[model samples]
Target chain A: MKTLIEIKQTPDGIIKADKVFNKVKDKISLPNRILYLGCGSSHFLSKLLAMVTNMHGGLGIALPCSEFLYSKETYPIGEVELAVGISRSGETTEILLALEKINVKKLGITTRESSLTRMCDYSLVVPAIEESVVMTHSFTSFYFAYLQLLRYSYGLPPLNAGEISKATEKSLEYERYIREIVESFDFQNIIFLGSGLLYPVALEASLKMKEMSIFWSEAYPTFEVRHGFKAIADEKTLVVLMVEEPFEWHEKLVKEFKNQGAKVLVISNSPQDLGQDYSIELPRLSKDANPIPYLPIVQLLSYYKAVSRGLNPDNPRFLDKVVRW
Target chain B: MKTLIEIKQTPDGIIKADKVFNKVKDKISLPNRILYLGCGSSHFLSKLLAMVTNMHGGLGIALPCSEFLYSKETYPIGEVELAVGISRSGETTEILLALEKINVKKLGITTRESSLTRMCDYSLVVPAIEESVVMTHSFTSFYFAYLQLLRYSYGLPPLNAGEISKATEKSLEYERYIREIVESFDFQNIIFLGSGLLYPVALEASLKMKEMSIFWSEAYPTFEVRHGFKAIADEKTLVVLMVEEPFEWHEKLVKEFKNQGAKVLVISNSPQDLGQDYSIELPRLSKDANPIPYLPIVQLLSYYKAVSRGLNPDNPRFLDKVVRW
Candidate 1:
C-alpha cells in the first residue's frame, strides 16, 4: 500500500476517537482555559494546536512538558477544564505524571492503543505506527486528527476534508519534484517565512531542516524578514516562503524578497505568476486548513534536502529519538 | 556625594513627576492596555513596569525595543492606549522611531532632557545627569521613578514610603561592607535569581556583570532554581539571590540552592540568620515596593565587581557606547 493509504488505515480507530472526543467535549461544557501540553515535536505540534484553538476563539495555551512538570504556576488552574496532552508513545513518564498532578479532566493524543488511552478521560489515537524510531506519517496523522477536533470545537463548518485528502495525494506526487530542486541547490543557510497559522509550520519545518541537515536555518514571519535579519539575505541564502492561499500580502513579500537579491522559493497549492526561481505546489486546501496537508510537502522537502546534503533522515546528529526534560 | 545620595538626587524631578503621573491616571478613564518598550537595562525596567501595571489591575505588555521596531504585528495597535518608552539617555532611536510609528499617547522615562523626550507626548525626567558614562545612579533613579508611577497608577496604599527610604539608605550603607567580598570573589560564571518583579532586575544585573566583568552569567526565577540548570553550579559559580521581604520563601529557595554546592549571596532588607557567605541588609521596604530600592545594590555590585576584576566598567569589550538597531 502507498504511504498515504497505509497512514489512512491507522485512523480506522477514528470511530473510537469520535466517541471519546465527543464525550470530553460534552463533559467540559465550557472551559475558561484550554492547555495543550507535550514535548519535542509533539510540543511544537501542541503550539500549532493551541494556535488553532485560539484562532477559533477558544482560550487555549500551550506548555512545554518540562515547564509543566517543573512549574505548576505556569499552568492555568481554577477554571481550567480541558488539558490535552500529546505524546506519540502515550507512555512518556513526565507527561503522565504531570497529568496526574492536575485536577482537571485530561485528554491524551497518542498513537499507542492501550496505556495512555486507558489513563486519560478521553484519547484520540492516530493510526500510523509502523516506525519505531523516526516520526514519519504519525506526526501528520496526529495533526489531521487535531485539525478535525479544532473544527468541531470551534463550530467551524466542515472543512473541505475531501480536498485536503486529494491535496495530500497530489503533494506526494511531487516528492521527486522537490528532490530535483534539492539536488540543484547547494546553499549553506536556509530561512523560512510564513504568516498566520503557517508561521508556526515554518518554524517546525526550520527545526526539522536544522535537525536533519545539520544546517543553519531560521524561521520568521514574512513581515519580520525586513528587520535586522534581512541583512543576511544573499545569493547563498535559500529563502522559502510558505504562501497562504488567496493571501496577496505574501505575494508582495515574495516580490520584495526577490528584489533584495535572494533566491526566493514559493510553496503553495495555487502558485501565482510571480516571476520566481522555484515553486513547490501542494494539493488545494483552505488557508486555515493548509497546515494539515502542507505538512507532508515540508516533511518531504526536509527529508530529501537532508539526503541531498549527504545526511541521514532517520537519525540526525546530537539528538535523541525521544527528548525527555 | 555618595552613590545612594546621587541616586536619591537623581529623582529630584519626581516632585514634578507627580503632576505628569497624576494626569496619566486621570486621562486613563478605564484601565487600558499599556505597552512598555525599552532595550537592555532599560528593557528590564520595562518588564518590572509591566508587572506593576498588571498588579494594579491594568493590562500591560512589554516588548523589546528592537522587536517592536522591526515587527509591527508584535505591538497591539487597537488595544493600546498608552505607550511607555524607557531609555537612560532619552536618545535611543529605535524606541523613538517605534513611538513615532505607534502614534499613541506616550510617556518618555529617562535622565537626559534630550531628543527622545522631545518626540514623546510627555516626559518623566529623572535627576541623573551627574553620573559618569557608567550607569550607577541612573539605574536606581529610573527604578524609583518606575515605582512612583506604579503607586500613582495603582493607587497602591502609601508604601510606608519612609520605610522604603530607610531601606534604600541602608542598602547603600551596606554596599561598602560587601564591596570587598564582591571584589575578592573570582567567579568564572554567575547565576542571579529574583522572584516576581525582581526577576528582571536579576537579569539586568547578570547582563551588566557579563558586559563589565566578561563573565558567563545566567538569570532565572528563584523558584526555578530546582530545575536542570542548577546542575552547572559549583564553587566558581557565584549565585546572587535578590531575597524578597517576609523572607520565608526566599530563605527556603536560597538554602536549597546552597545545598547544590553553589556559593550563595543574599541581598535583602530583613535580618536573616542564615549561614550564607554574604547577606547584605537593605533598608526595610514594603514587599510590593522593594524592587525600587534594590536596584542600586545590584548596579553597585556590577560596577564594583567590574573594577575589582581590573576592567573598566564604562568601556566593556565588543560593545558600543550606543547600540543602534
Candidate 2:
C-alpha cells in the first residue's frame, strides 16, 4: 500500500476542505468558551486548533476525548458553550461517548458521515479519506477546514488555501532527501521540538514516528528542551525542530543539540542552516498556518524510517485504523 | 551530598506549606478564569493544579512559562483573570518573564522569596528549602500549598495535610525495594502513565527520571498508552503506572504491557497484583491527593537508577539548580 500517497494527498485534502468549508462558513458560529476534543492524531490536531484559536484571542481549550468521556470534570456543564470533536474516522468510541456526555452544542469534524456526524448537533466532513491505520492527510485536512472556519468566525484574515495547498505540494519534493537523512542517521531515539503554534506539529510528528516505526520518539516545546529534557540527547538521538523563522535562539538550540553529539534536522521557512546536519526549507506561510506545509515532511520521515526498519508504515503493529473500546 | 534527604523531606515540606497557607487561606480568592504558568517540574505541577481546579468546575488552564513569556496568546490579559506562576526556586527566568509580561492578577508559589515573589501581586512561600538542584520537597510543598489554597477558594473539601504527610513519610519504607526494582530492571526506556489528577505525576516522574538518571523517559495519560505509545513497550522498557484505584481497565492495561514483554511496576492504593512484575501499595488517601504518597516511589526509582548508572542524582550533569537565562 502506498501510505505515502495518503501523506502526499495532504494538499488535495486541504483544497477540497477549503472548498467545502467556505460554502457553509456562514453557518458556523463558535462561542467564547469552546472545547476541542479528539484522540490519537486528532487529539494533537485539537490542540493545534485550540492553540490557534486561543492565539487569536478566543477561549479554545483541548483535551483528550477519553478524558471528557470518563471524567465529568473535563466537560464543565454550563461553562463550555461548544465542543468540537475531530476524528478521521467518525467511529472513535471515545469521541462519540464524549459528545454524548456533554449537553453543550457539539460539532463533529470528520471525513465521513458516520455515528459522530449523526450524534453531533452539527458536523463538517473533510473531503479526505485514509486507508492507512495512521492519520496523514486526513489530520491536516480536518485542521485546515476547522482553522479556516475559525478564522471566518473570528473575522481574522483567512488562510490562503491556494498558497497553503501549493506549499504543501512543494514540501513533498524533499521526500527523497528526507529518506536519505533518515537512512543515514542510525539513531535509537528521536525527539521533535516546536514552540507555540508548531508545538502540536512536534507532538503529531513524534506520534507518527512512534506509530509508524514503533521507535522511541517523543516531543517537547522547543525551549523546554533546555529544562532537563536534553539529558537524553546523545549519539543515538536525532532531534528534529520545526522553526517558523530564523531566530537567534533557534540557532543556539541547534548548536546545543549538536554539542550533545546528536544529529539535528531543521525544517524552517528559510534555507540558511543553523549548524544542523540537514535542513528542509518550506515555502513561507502564515505563522499560524505554518504547520500545514510541514506536515508531509514529518509524515514522510516516519514513513521512510519505517521502511528503512523493515516495517509497513500503512499497517503499524498493534494499531487499528479506528480506535474503539 | 545527601540528595535523598531532600527527597525524603517531602512530607515535612507538605506540613510546612499547610501551616503557612492555612494562616492566609481566607484571604485567597480565585477568579473564574485563572492561568497557571510554570516550566519543567513546575510546569507539570501547573497542569495538575489546572486539572484539579477544572475538576471542581473552575476554569483553570495551564501553559509553560516560556510559552507565556514568548507568546502573548498564552496570557490573554482581559480573558485570564489571574496568572499563577509556579517555580520552586522563585528565580526561573521564564516564570519571572512570563509574570512580568502579563497584566492579570499575579500570584507566585515558591520555596524562597526571590524575584518571582517580589514581582507577583502576591506570593506564598512553601517553607521547604532545597540544597539539591532538582526540586523534591519544594515541588510537592509548593503544589500542596497552592492546592489547599485552591480548594479553600473553590469551597471543596481540603486535603487532609496531616494524613497526606504521614502517608508520604510512610511511603519511604519502600526505598530499599525501589532500589532493588530499579537495579533488577535493565531497561533502556521508561514510561509513566496516570490519569486525571495523577497525570501530572506521571509527567513529573518522567521528567525526574530523565533529569536525574539521564535516561529515556516519557509520560502519557493512562488510556493514551494504548493509542500508539504501547508500540515502544517491550523488554527494553520499564512501564510505571500510577493508578488511583483498581479499575478493570487498569488491570487490562497492566496485562497488555506485560504481554508485550515490558516490566510493569504498578503503584496504586491497595494493590492486589495486577499481573505485573512488581507493585508498590501506597496508603489510601483522598482521590485527588493520591499522588502525594506515591511521589517517593518515583523519586527513589530515579535516584537508585542514577546511582546504578554511576551518576549522582542530586547534581545531575548539564543541569543547574536555577534555570535562569
Candidate 3:
C-alpha cells in the first residue's frame, strides 16, 4: 500500500505549492477571518474549507466568487483580516480584483504558477496538473492541504504514524469500490442527496457528474424528494444518498425513495440495510473527517462515469482546463 | 383615488379574508416565530410575510415548503412557535404531513378556502376567485392583507387618511405604466437583480415572468453579474436592476454591463446617472415597504407580457393551480 508520505511527494505536475505555503506563512499575519472564495468545483472546496476552519476555531466564510461581485455588501468586506481566494486557474477576474481591493492580508489557493500568484500577497499552488478540464485532482489536493492547515490551526496532535499509512490504503480501496459500482450501473440521470452540511457535497457530486458524463443530474436534501418533485423519479434514476452517522431517520427516508421506484444507493460508514445495490463503506473517521474520505469516491465515480459515457474525463465539452476570468 | 377601506370591501368573487383573520386570532396563540412556507407564487408570499413580520418585531423564517419536507432536520421543526403554510390551491401533501408530524400550531394561506380551511387551525382566503388560474389579483389582495397585519403587529400610529387613500391610487398608476412597458419590450430572456432582502423580490419577478410569458428568466444579485455570467448579456437580455439605496460601486458595475451591450433598466426610488435605457421610479416609502409597491408593477408586467406572448396568464404549462402530492 502507498503511504501518506509517498502520496504527498508524488509529482502530479500542477504546481509547486509548498513554496507558496512557506512564503505565505513567513510574510502574512493571520487574519480575523479567512474568506475562501471560488466558483464551481473550487467554490465547493471553499465550503469544506470554511467548515474545517470554523471547526479549528477560525472564523471563515465561503462565498461563490460570483456572489462576491454581485452582493459585495452582504460580505464583511474591508474588515476581513485575510481573504483566501481559490481558483484553480488563477485567472478568475472577479476573485483577482476582489483580492486586489482588500487592504488586509490575502492568499490564493491555485495551480497556475504563472497566474494570479504574482498579484497576491501569498498563494498555495497544488501539485495536480491538467488531467481534467473540470478540476479533479486540483480540487482534491487543495482539500487535503486545507485539512492540513486546519490541523495546524487547531494545534491538534498529528495523526498516528500508522494512521497516515492507512489513509492512502483506504483511499485506494475507496477508489476501487466506486470504480466497480460505476461499471455496474447504466443510468441516464443521477440525483445526489444529502442533508445539512452534506447538502453542498451533494451539489458538488452533481456538478462532477454533469462535467464528466454530460448527464442530467441534480442535488437536493434527501427528504426533498417526497415533494411533488418525486414525479421525476423512476427506475432509470440513480439516486445516491449520502448518509451520516446516527443514521436511522435518514435511512427510512432513503427507503421511501426506493419504494417510489428510485434505485437508491447509500454511502455511509455505519452499517444499514441498503438492500441489493453496492455499498461504498467509508472508513470510520471523526464526523469532521467524514467529508474528506467520501470525496474520493465521488471523484472516482465521476472519472469512471466519464469513461463509460465515452467522454474524456480530462476535458468536458466547451470547457477550458483553467477558468480564469 | 381608491382607499384601503374601499379596496378591502370590493368584492371580486373570492371571499374577503376578514373572517379568516378573526378565526386565526380567536383560535391560535400569538407565535413568537412565524414560519412561512410555500413555493413559486406562494413562496414569494412567504417572503413578503416574513419581511412584514420582521418589521413588526416578530421573528419569521421564509422557507420553501419543498425544503421543509426534504430537509426537516436543518430547520427548527418542533421548535417553531407557529407555522403558516401558503399554497394557492391548499393541497400540498408534503407540507401538510410535515406540519402534522411535528404537531406544530399551524395556519393556511390559500385561495381555495373550503377544504384547506377545515384542515388547518386557521386559514386566510384572499379575494381571487374571479381569476381562474393565474395569481395577479390574488397576490395583490394577499399583499394588502399582509400590510394590515404588519400595522397591527407593530401597534404603530394609524396611517394618515391621505396616505391610506394614496396607496391604492399609486397601485393603479403603477399598473398603467407596467402595462405599457410590457407591450413595448420584446425580451427573450429576463434577468432580475437585487441585493439583501430585495433578492426575494427579484426571485418573485423571475417567477412571474416565467409563469406568465413562458419565457426563460432568472434572478441574481446585481453585483454577481461581473462574474463570468455577464457573457450572457446582449441586446435580447432585459436586465432589471433593483436599487433601493445609494450603492455607488454597484451602480458602476451596472454601468459596465450597459457598456457591454445589454439593455439595462433601473428600478429605483431616486434616479442616478446609471446609463439605464428605462427607469421605474417608485414612491418613496420606508425601506421595508419598498418591495410592496414594486409587487403590483411586476404583476401587471407579467400579465401583459403573457398576453403579448399569446399565453394564458391564468394558466402556465406543466404546473397545476395547487401542487398536491
Best of the candidates, DockQ: 2
Using TM-score, rank the candidates from best to worst.
2, 3, 1
For every prediction, compared with the true complex, DockQ reads 0.08, 0.55, 0.13
TM-score of each: 0.60, 0.94, 0.61
- Point to the candidate with the largest lDDT: 2
lDDT score for candidate 3 against the true structure: 0.61
* Candidate 2 off by > 4 Å: A74-78, A156-158, A271-273, B26-31, B74-78, B155-159, B271-273
Interface RMSDs of the predictions, in order, are 8.0, 2.2, 6.5
DockQ head-to-head 1 vs 2, winner = 2
Tens digits of lDDT, candidate 2, A1-325 = 5688899898899898898788879887877778889887888988888888877778777888766655556333336889998888899888888888788899999998899999988888886988888888988888888888888888888888988999998999998899898878888889999888788999999999998998888898888878888888888889999887767878888888888899999998877779988889999877777888888999999998898899998888777777777
State the interface C-alpha RMSD of candidate 1.
Answer: 8.0
Per-residue CA lDDT of model 1 for B268-315, tens digit only, reads: 666866557787766555545667667667766766776777876565
Error of 3 at B48 (Å): 5.0
TM-score of chain B of 2: 0.95
In model 3, how many backbone clashes occur? 13
> Over the stretch A224-276, how does candidate 3's per-residue lDDT look in tens digits?
54433443456776788887663455666666667756677778776867562
